[PDB]
């Protein structure tokens, strides 16, 4: 691809077959795949800068520095969340080529087979069901040895991995005692915490070694590095440029093959017309905003901010499915995972080794299925193979963290711990659906984000049980004297009431949002896109990104986005023969 820093740098007289709005995770898959046809020309318009020389984004262990408040973040926050003591939550999202694949924690999780089968059923397309989609996921994957060629025997099952694809996946790990204490806990508490060889086999329940989108040179593998980099000159990428609206090519029709864009709110709007289609790939937050600012949305909402409704679809921006999470911290006497970061960065720079080479400071995920009697409501999961709860072990540190700790969350008593074991406990199937709406009709104004956190009681109840589950893991015989009492929440906070009060102050968003432009069958009474990814009621316009995925999986969402984007790419290309 050729990257252009400003619209005036674009070459004159070029007509593009496809224009992709959002050079993110999905957007770069689509642009890169469609460009495989040498006769097609593809323009990507991306709000952020190029990922090139975005140095910190290359370093896997610096990922934790890239969320809310970072130089590359959108700095989205939510409306006050009345289920969380009125708190406004951050909603970290990357503003940069590759989108969230450039800034995320690199976790590679496919979700359970039930998730894919659930989506397949809702959408009415069995091509998205597990048996049908798994081969495509493998084809898209390039699992690799890490830079140091560490043995991952017994850490993954090569059976479920592709080795020849686009997106690099690896599983480098530190050699720490915690690893063995976790494994021995699986023998003690095997009913709740069995060992899981490969959580990407469709059945993720258990304790698994984490897999990451990290290449063979200990650099982040993003959609820019995996897909865009190898493309030819028929891909043009315009960065630092906001798509403001999509527009009718005919002017009174719903053939939304035109895009409008501008470099800032005080600059000239420019327009281009795609010969075939505009593919909106702005992600779960931005794609609904682009569509609403284009007149595609809930008429009353649009009217109230001065936008003429061209397509009245009240599902636009609705059904935001994400995951609520809290940190939990235990007193521990285990060795810290901390290190001198400057020193480690010099090491990564000089040798591509050291802790910054790895995707996290601990090496495992746990996926826990709660029994029916610890579900205070109907089971919200996709099926029997699906976990309700994730543990994402973060670090061991004598310093109380700010990451994963909301601003006014009470901190553990200094004297209550030696070191802290921090992990996130995530309610993977948080049923309370949120929304994206407009404050005004200016595309440069951020949209209103509601996560509707804890509207449904099952969501906080599941998280409470997730905390209790963590308590059981670190109560194992293996862990005795190594990992001791809870300190966040306090050890004395044991009741439903007391954990709920803790959760209102401690819960934040896991930012695995999907669903705001939901895919539904053609003729369904709700949703925004048909199974062909086309916006209902339009021509020349598709949405391909997390917004179409009907509900969040039991997983981190990058892989599902890549796999939807690959699925869309294939069918778009096919439609033009
Ligand atoms: C931000 C974030 C995401 C995630 C994690 C951590 C952080 C802080 N960690 C993860 O859990 C991880 O470890 N593993 C994962 O599987 N998932 C993680 N994760 C979420 C994941 O990255 C995310 O769901 C997925 O990447 C979403 O992809 P997609 O739907 O394609 O959205 P983006 O990648 O955000 O791309 C949108 C793209 O669009 C640009 N943009 C937005 N609005 C405009 C306009 N109007 N015009 C032009 N461009 C626009 C964005 O800047 C972006 O590049
Ligand atoms: C959010 O998604 C749900 C589907 O999961 C939609 O629920 C459907 O709503 C229609 C229209 O009222 C009903 O006919 C269906 O029976 C519902 N299906 C299910 C599974 O509940 C819902 O309409 C979506 N909401 C919005 C605003 O888009
Ligand atoms: C997000 O805030 C950070 C910290 O102030 C800043 O560096 C960055 O430019 C902000 N993002 C945007 C889109 O302005």
Numbering used by the authors: 1 to 577
Sentences from the paper on this structure:
Pyranose dehydrogenase (PDH; pdh1 gene; pyranose:acceptor oxidoreductase; EC 1.1.99.29; sequence UniProt: Q3L245_9AGAR) from the litter-decomposing fungus Agaricus meleagris (synonym Leucoagaricus meleagris, Agaricus praeclaresquamosus, California fungus) is an extracellular, monomeric flavin-dependent oxidoreductase, with one flavin adenine dinucleotide (FAD) prosthetic group covalently bound per polypeptide chain. Like several other fungal sugar oxidoreductases, AmPDH belongs to the glucose-methanol-choline (GMC) oxidoreductase family; and as the fungal pyranose 2-oxidase from Trametes multicolor (TmP2O), AmPDH produces aldoketose or diketose derivatives from non-phosphorylated sugars.
Here we report the crystal structure of AmPDH (the translated product of pdh1), refined at 1.6 Å resolution, featuring a C(4a)-modified flavin ring. The observed value of –152° for the N(10)–C(10)–C(4a)–C(4) dihedral angle in the AmPDH adduct agrees reasonably well with those generated by DFT calculations and with the synthetic flavin O-adducts, but is distinct from the modified flavin in AgCHO. Although it is too early to speculate on the general mechanistic significance of the N–N distance, undoubtedly, the intimate association of these two active-site side chains in the dehydrogenases leads to closer interaction not only with each other, but also with a hypothetical C(4a) adduct, however without generating steric hindrance or clashes. This is confirmed by the tight association of His512 Nε2 and His556 Nδ1 atoms with the C(4a)-oxygen species in AmPDH. An interesting observation is that TmP2O, which is capable of both oxygen reactivity and flavin C(4a)-intermediate stabilization, features a distance of ∼4 Å between the side-chain nitrogen atoms of the catalytic pair, i.e., the N–N distance. This distance is considerably shorter in the two sugar-oxidizing dehydrogenases that are unable to react with oxygen (∼3 Å in PDH and CDH), and longer in AnGOX (∼5 Å), which reacts readily with oxygen but does not form a C(4a)-flavin intermediate. At this point, we make no claims that the flavin C(4a) adduct is a functionally relevant intermediate during the oxidative half-reaction of AmPDH, but rather, an artifact arising from attack by reactive oxygen species on the C(4a) position during irradiation of the protein crystal. The protein used for crystallization was in the reduced state, making such reactions possible.
